[PDB]
A paper describes a structure:
A recently found family of pore-forming toxins, called CDC-like proteins (CDCLs), are wide-spread in gut microbes and are a prevalent means of antibacterial antagonism. Analysis of the CDCLs belonging to the phylum Bacteroidota revealed the presence of sets of two-component CDCLs, one long CDCL (CDCLL) with four domains and one short CDCL (CDCLS) lacking the fourth C-terminal domain, that act as a bicomponent complex via a mechanism only previously observed in the mammalian complement MAC. Unlike CDCs, the CDCLs require proteolytic activation with both components containing a proteolytically cleavable activation loop critical to the regulation of pore formation. Here, we present the crystal structure of a proteolytically activated CDCLL and cryo–electron microscopy (cryo-EM) structures of a prepore-like intermediate and the transmembrane pore.
(A) The cryo-EM map at 3.13-Å resolution of the prepore-like structure from focused refinement with C30 symmetry, revealing a circular oligomer with a pore inner diameter of 164 Å and a height of 59 Å. We built an atomic model of the full prepore-like oligomer into the cryo-EM map, which consists of 30 EaCDCLS subunits, each lacking the activation loop and preceding N-terminal region. A comparison of the EaCDCLS protomer in the prepore state with the crystal structure of the monomeric proform of EaCDCLS reveals that while the α-HBs remain in their helical state, the β5 strand of the core D3 β sheet has undergone a complete β-to-α transition to create the HTH motif as observed in the membrane-inserted form of CDCs. This HTH forms a small α barrel within the interior of the circular oligomer. Thus, loss of the activation loop and corresponding β0 strand, together with the transition of β5, has allowed for the β4 and β1 strands of the core β sheet to form oligomeric contacts between adjacent subunits. This corresponds with the canonical oligomeric rearrangement and interactions observed in CDCs. Comparison of the core β sheet between monomeric EaCDCLS and the prepore-like structure also reveals the loss of the twist observed in the monomeric state, with a slight rotation and straightening of the β1-β4 strands. Therefore, we hypothesize that the stacked rings are “prepore-like” structures composed of act-EaCDCLS protein alone, similar to the circular prepore intermediate observed in CDCs. However, any putative physiological prepores would be expected to be composed of 1 EaCDCLL molecule and 29 EaCDCLS molecules, similar to the transmembrane pore, but such a short-lived intermediate would not been captured here because of the long incubation time of the experiment.
Residue numbers in the entry:
A (entry chain O), B (entry chain P), C (entry chain Q), D (entry chain N): 94 to 295, 309 to 378
Amino acid sequence: SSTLTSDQIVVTVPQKTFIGGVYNSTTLDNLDYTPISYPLDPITVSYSFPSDFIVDTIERPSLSSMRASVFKAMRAANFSGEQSLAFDYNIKQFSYYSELKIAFGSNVNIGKIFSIDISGSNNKIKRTTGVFAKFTQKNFTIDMDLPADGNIFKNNSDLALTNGKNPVYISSVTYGRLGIISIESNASYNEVNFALKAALTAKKILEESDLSVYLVGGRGTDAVQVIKGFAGFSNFIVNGGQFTPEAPGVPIYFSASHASDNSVYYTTFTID
Amino acid sequence: SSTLTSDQIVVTVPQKTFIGGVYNSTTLDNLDYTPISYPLDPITVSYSFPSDFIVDTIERPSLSSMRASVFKAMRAANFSGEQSLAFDYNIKQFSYYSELKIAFGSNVNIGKIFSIDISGSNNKIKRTTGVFAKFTQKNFTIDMDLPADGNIFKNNSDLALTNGKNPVYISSVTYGRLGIISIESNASYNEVNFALKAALTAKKILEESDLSVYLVGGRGTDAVQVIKGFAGFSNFIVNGGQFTPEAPGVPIYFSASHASDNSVYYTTFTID
Amino acid sequence: SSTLTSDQIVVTVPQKTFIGGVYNSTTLDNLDYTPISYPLDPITVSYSFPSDFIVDTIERPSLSSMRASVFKAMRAANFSGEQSLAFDYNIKQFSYYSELKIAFGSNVNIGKIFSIDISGSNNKIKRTTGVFAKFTQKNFTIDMDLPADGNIFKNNSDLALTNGKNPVYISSVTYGRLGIISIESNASYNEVNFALKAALTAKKILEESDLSVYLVGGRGTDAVQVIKGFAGFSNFIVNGGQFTPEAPGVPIYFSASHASDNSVYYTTFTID
Amino acid sequence: SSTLTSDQIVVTVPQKTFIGGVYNSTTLDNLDYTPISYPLDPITVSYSFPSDFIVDTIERPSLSSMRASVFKAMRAANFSGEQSLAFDYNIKQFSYYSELKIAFGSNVNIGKIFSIDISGSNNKIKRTTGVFAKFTQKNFTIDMDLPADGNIFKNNSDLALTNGKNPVYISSVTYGRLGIISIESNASYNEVNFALKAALTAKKILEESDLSVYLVGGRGTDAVQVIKGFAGFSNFIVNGGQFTPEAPGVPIYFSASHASDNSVYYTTFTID
Ligand SMILES: [Ca+2]
Ligand SMILES: [Ca+2]
Ligand SMILES: [Ca+2]
Ligand SMILES: [Ca+2]
């Protein structure tokens, strides 16, 4: 029905979403992740949060190296997690599940995010109205410097070999928490949104409506209290605003570059 | 009736679901697990949780090696289990048992998960309405780095031999807790869901309905209290949110890769 | 009337259900246990519970070796029994005794589990309605690594000799507690289930109904209190949730592998 | 519908918005970022905030170098964050989403800033009236001195090579916090603005209206309290006015120069 382009791609495979990973763009749009196996020059990475250890060098770009560097940087002295990078929060209405990927911002498997069936005629909401409140807090980012020679490859000649398989290397990874409290009801949206806002900022619709809660990151003790009612979600948001070495966060978003002109990559996702 | 594809396959055989295990894809879809017996290069693994011991090397990928590495990593100093990875929770409606595998996310033996008969005309629920509340908390993951040479095999020539038997190696394993409180009743869903939500967030339908509770992982002391009523399940969820070395968790989900292009593997399960 | 296939076979002969035991599949389906007498390569075993002693090596697979290894592993330091592996609990209805083996999950001798006669026309319940509440707590498992050379035999040539007698070696053994409180009554199921649930979560039907209690494992002091009423069974479940070296548990379930392709074995049991 | 030119471009890619970065102007207007890979002379940078370490020299202009220099300058002695650089705050009305980029000041992806769809006929607001209160606090800036020889390149001859690809180097980067509390309602603007101003400076419209909150920078503890109501946003503004080394701020605005005559660059963005 529509197509959307975004530069901040959502983290669908954490095993393969690491700094310096090179992947084909068509595969990323398809939601696959096909790596381009070629040696890379040593890369330089920097951290948004202030600490005595910000600049790091990685000889071999790998997820283990990225995780170890993040751990040591956040364990370094003079580290402050009091300031975050961004905090988005919105209560919107959805009538299809395929359009719920707009909230995430890129191509996602909603059928696995929420234990539902979407294929076929089930893309429409079972109930009458579908509302959802979503929040996304970005604490810090790891960003990688552009290549000194203009090519990320170590031989500087694999670009000619990689024709047809468009190289695209991950340049940035965003760490933070995410949460959605999707609600399906048979009442009117004017009252469903009123009840949702009252519950979040403080009766029968919220008790007769279908709930679908999905949380990424954050304190587990606060996250598990969501089942206790609508105060649990607001406590999961209010608490844990400041990130600590104990609770760094889970990679939620990542940015990509074209590996040829080193420009930014815009993923494309279609919504029906 | 329908087919679904998912990248996070559910752990059906814990004995064979270990990091680096190579298995045929057709067998995994069939729910069998046929290993590809061939030497593998030493692998590098990383842990989602922050600790002084994150990066590990495994010469021979095996379940005992994975378990020992997980134990030593979680016993290492500067370990924090306060932050989890994900927390999904939903109360949905099911009218068949074969479609209950949507909640798990992959092909499962519901006939062995719940002590029922599904084969034949028994796939439909015995009672009128079937509801179920399910929760899944993912605490941490072990993820393995992509091969440096692009091939996971140690001879780099077994790929030619393994034609027809599509190699697929386990790249990630998810640790966490899972729980379902499936309920069958003769009343209306509008009241059954209301009663379930009231019991979880706080009378005759819940006492005259058929119960089916299935829990994976978590504290045993909290899990055994589920039989005491509906407060036991909510206490099993609320308590044990933060994972500790005493209670690491049971592997619930795992991701797979194609071992030829090192892309992600999407398992396929049909629902009738 | 129906046939069922399951991968988690129930422990019918504890003397012969040990890790590494090789038995014919036809015999296991028949409920016999015919060993395949052939030397085996040394095997590696791992334990689900966290302890300083997880990985063990067994030169000669035997029940005494398995028991000694389990004892020493659970007596090792840094052992935590606070987390279990699974906890299933369901209150179902049965109208035949042959179909009561669905609750166990494999072929069992119900005629010896409950001191009744099933052969002939006695397979039906004597009373009008038959209900049963069953619980199964799995604390930990011992699992054995796949053979390095792909063959479990020590000569690597006994596979050719073992044709017709399909080799099947036990790969995993599950330790835990089990319990069933089978009830036969002349009233309606809608009231029998109500009374059972009220008694378990807290009058004449439960006192005029026929009782059949079967418990495997758990604390003996709590198990013997079942005869005192319906609070004894709920106390046997609530207490002893956390397993200790004093009360490890009895092998209740075991998994098997085909010893040729090392795939998982699915036992088949028919229900009439 | 209209075109606007501004000299303070908004930070859309923090990974590529660093001091000394050279990018094509057409790409910046397109919202792409294509770097001009050429060696640069060592640059001199200065900091708006008063500290013992103000003047810095950067041999290789990179994001990691800029971040490290900012960290060390703000950690230097005799640093005062009591005085900021600017504080803009306005409550305006918007009837389209494409015109909401006027508040930011340059070309932005409103479709990713707010989880909405804009492409096609959805550019209009779903509700009747659209109001928004926005605040932007600029604490300090890093500014780079003009080249001594009049050319930023290190060979002083790459200007002839870079014809057609108009070089444009980032000269200044603004650090600060930003926030918008966009509101959609069905009432009249005369009452919606009244309610918004009363809530910010202190009932049914604000509870039945659709909320869209977007915050960049600032204290996370204060930012997460926005969900609690309208006092959270006013507390996020009132608190954290003075910037500290613990909470420096996120780059929100940057200025650019033409790299040929060293004049200021005016980006152009169209609004429909
Ligand atoms: Ca290079
Ligand atoms: Ca290899
Ligand atoms: Ca052998
Ligand atoms: Ca120059």
